Structures are given as C-alpha cells and as structure tokens.
C-alpha cells in the first residue's frame with residue numbers, strides 16, 4: 001500500500017516512476033494491431049472495421065470505471081481507511097456488472113437500428129452483425145479490466161499493470177498464428193486471440209490480487225464524468241470533421257493521416273495523468289493540499305516538456321514524412337499546414353487535461369467537465385465559424401479556430417489551480 005515517496009518525496013521522481021510503467025503498458029496496446037495485420041497478411045469479412053467504434057465506446061466506458069475506481073481507492077488509502085477500500089472494490093465490481101448487463105441487453109434489442117447508423121448492407125451486414133454480437137460477449141470482461149486497472153492504479157502499483165500488459169501482448173503474438181494455422185479460424189481467430197489476450201490479463205490481475213447510495217454516487221459521478229468527457233472529445237472531432245469536409249475534401253483526408261501520429265505524441269501526457277490521479281488522490285486523502293497542487297505543476301512540467309519535443313519533431317518531420325503517405329499533394333500540403341499551425345498547441349493541452357485529472361482525483365468532476373467543454377466546444381466552435389466563414393479564411397481558419405480552445409482552457413487551469421478558501425474547505429469536508 002505504501003508506495004515510497006508518495007507523501008514526502010521528490011514529485012518528479014514519484015510521477016515518473018509511476019508514469020513510465022504506464023507508458024510501457026500503453027505501447028503494448030499498439031502491438032495488437034501490428035501483430036494482427038502482420039498475420040492478416042496470410043474484402044468480405046472486412047466489415048469488421050464497421051464495428052470498430054463499438055470497441056472504442058467499450059474502452060471508453062471501461063476507462064470511466066477505472067478512474068472512478070482509481071479516484072475513490074486512492075483517497076481511501078490516503079485517508080488510511082482500508083475500510084471503504086474493500087467496499088470500493090465491491091461497489092466497483094457491481095457497477096461494472098450493471099454496466100455490462102445494460103449494454104448487452106440494449107446492445108441486443110436495439111442491435112439492428114444501432115448497426116444502421118454505422119454502415120450499409122449491400123455487401124457487408126451478416127458479417128457486421130456477427131462481429132457486433134461477438135463484441136457484446138466481450139463487455140463484462142472489458143469492464144472487469146477497468147475495475148482491475150482502477151484497483152492497481154489506485155494503490156500506486158503500476159508494475160502489475162505493466163506486467164499484465166506485457167503478458168497480454170505476448171499471448172496475442174503467439175495465438176494469432178495458432179488461430180490461423182492450427183484452428184483455421186481466419187479473421188475471427190485474430191479477433192479471438194486479442195480477446196484471450198485480454199482475459200489472460202484479467203487472470204493475471206486476480207491471481208496477483210490473491211494474497212449506501214452515497215458511495216455509488218461518489219464512484220458514479222467521477223466515473224460517468226469521465227465518459228461524458230470522452231463523448232465531448234468525440235463530438236469536438238465530429239464538428240471538426242464537419243467543417244473540414246464541407247470546405248475541402250483533401251483536408252479531411254489530411255486529418256486521416258495526421259490523426260494516429262497526433263495521438264501518439266499526446267500519449268506521454270496520458271501516462272503522466274494516470275500517475276497524477278494516484279498522487280493527487282492519495283495526498284488529498286492524507287490532507288496535504290499544497291502537495292497536490294505541487295503535484296499538478298510537477299506533472300505539467302513533465303508533460304509539457306516531453307510533448308513539446310514530440311511536437312517539434314512532428315513539425316519539422318512533416319514536410320518529408322507526409323508526401324510518403326500520399327501522392328495527392330493537396331493532401332500532404334494540408335497535413336503539413338495543419339501540423340505547422342496546430343502542433344505547438346499540443347503541449348498546452350497538458351495544462352487543462354491534467355487540471356481535469358486533478359478534479360477527478362479529488363472528487364469534483366464538474367470542473368473536469370468544465371475544462372473539457374472549454375477546450376473542445378465553448379470557444380472553438382464560435383471562433384472557427386468566425387475565422388473560416390465570416391472572415392474568409394477557410395481551412396486555415398479551422399486550424400486556428402480549433403486550437404483557440406486549448407489556449408483559453410490553459411488560462412482557466414492556471415487560474416483555478418492554486419490555494420483558495422474553497423479548495424481548503426473541500427479538503428476539510430473530505431477528511
């Protein structure tokens with residue numbers, strides 16, 4: 001339970017030692033697709049891709065369960081009640097269960113209409129429906145992993161998470177071949193290999209692990225706020241796609257190229273965020289508010305610094321890199337212009353995004369959502385409209401408008417994260 005350096009140590013050492021294992025775990029996740037497509041190399045079943053969004057709303061909900069778990073457990077530990085702690089796992093599991101039932105049941109009955117809003121059946125439907133159904137069979141297990149992730153992240157034991165992750169990636173590496181060759185299962189088999197990978201992780205956790213509406217409310221409010229924030233981010237990407245497409249179809253193709261890469265650059269900040277939840281949550285429970293504030297700015301210093309480097313790499317690399325990805329030069333031009341304009345905003349995203357983690361850690365999701373709304377909606381939409389339409393800038397106007405929310409939100413974070421009477425009162429009420 002202790003997690004050395006938590007209450008008295010160097011915050012940089014503390015956050016890094018926690019965030020680095022978490023980052024390794026995140027790299028394992030990528031290997032799945034690499035191994036999958038490597039073995040898929042040996043037009044009908046390929047509507048598996050149609051069902052891809054469903055897998056992502058499952059990780060999204062699992063993620064909300066994780067932070068609810070992480071947030072609540074880490075405050076209990078810091079308060080030194082391994083008391084509410086065993087309660088929390090219980091309530092964590094029960095919440096995960098009902099979420100799986102509601103999702104499988106509404107999944108099933110509304111299956112037909114839901115699938116319509118994804119893809120067209122002139123060729124792929126029966127393939128689509130089967131995979132949708134197999135996806136439903138994975139829900140409880142995915143939710144279970146959220147609980148477990150939330151359990152070991154709350155206790156600050158990330159090595160168990162990093163080792164679970166590695167075991168999962170090895171399993172998928174070995175099984176993918178066996179499903180193709182021994183069992184003759186095709187694409188289904190690589191999917192099933194990925195899934196037995198996830199269960200072996202689940203197994204690893206439980207084996208390691210061997211040896212009152214108020215509390216549903218506390219868990220549900222943080223956890224569901226996390227889901228609401230995924231949503232807002234997804235919606236902001238929709239409104240962005242809407243504008244890009246109606247202006248120039250090539251800019252929409254450019255974004256399709258930049259997206260995975262823009263996402264990797266941001267991952268080191270997601271790793272630090274996870275570490276910060278534990279440190280804020282536990283120091284908050286222990287009553288040390290100053291240290292939680294120092295913890296946030298230690299995290300911003302790490303995250304900003306790393307992402308700025310990855311961002312600058314992207315910008316200078318883009319002119320040489322993107323032409324290799326496409327022969328249409330309007331598409332590689334748009335991708336280069338987008339990166340050049342928006343890339344430096346990325347490290348600034350750390351300021352408001354870590355601010356969101358802090359409020360989740362201390363049980364105040366309202367300000368988590370406030371900062372996410374401020375970043376992806378309240379500023380961006382009206383400013384993009386202003387710059388891309390009224391002022392006659394077009395795609396260049398989208399790029400500038402869209403990143404203006406990141407700056408305002410960074411301003412907000414900076415103002416809110418500091419000693420205040422209310423913040424100190426909040427900690428009095430907590431302990």
Ligand SMILES: CCCCCCCC/C=C/CCCCCCCC(=O)OC[C@H](O)CO
Pocket residue numbers: 233236237239240262266338342343345346349375376377380381401402403405406
């Ligand atoms: C969780 C991550 C949140 C970060 C989001 C802030 C984006 C600012 C810079 C990103 C440039 C790289 C991607 C370029 C296209 C991003 C589209 C986008 O983020 O749009 C923001 C706003 O919602 C418009 O409507």
Ligand SMILES: C[As](C)(=O)[O-]
Pocket residue numbers: 422
């Ligand atoms: C109304 As209050 C407890 O957020 O100051």
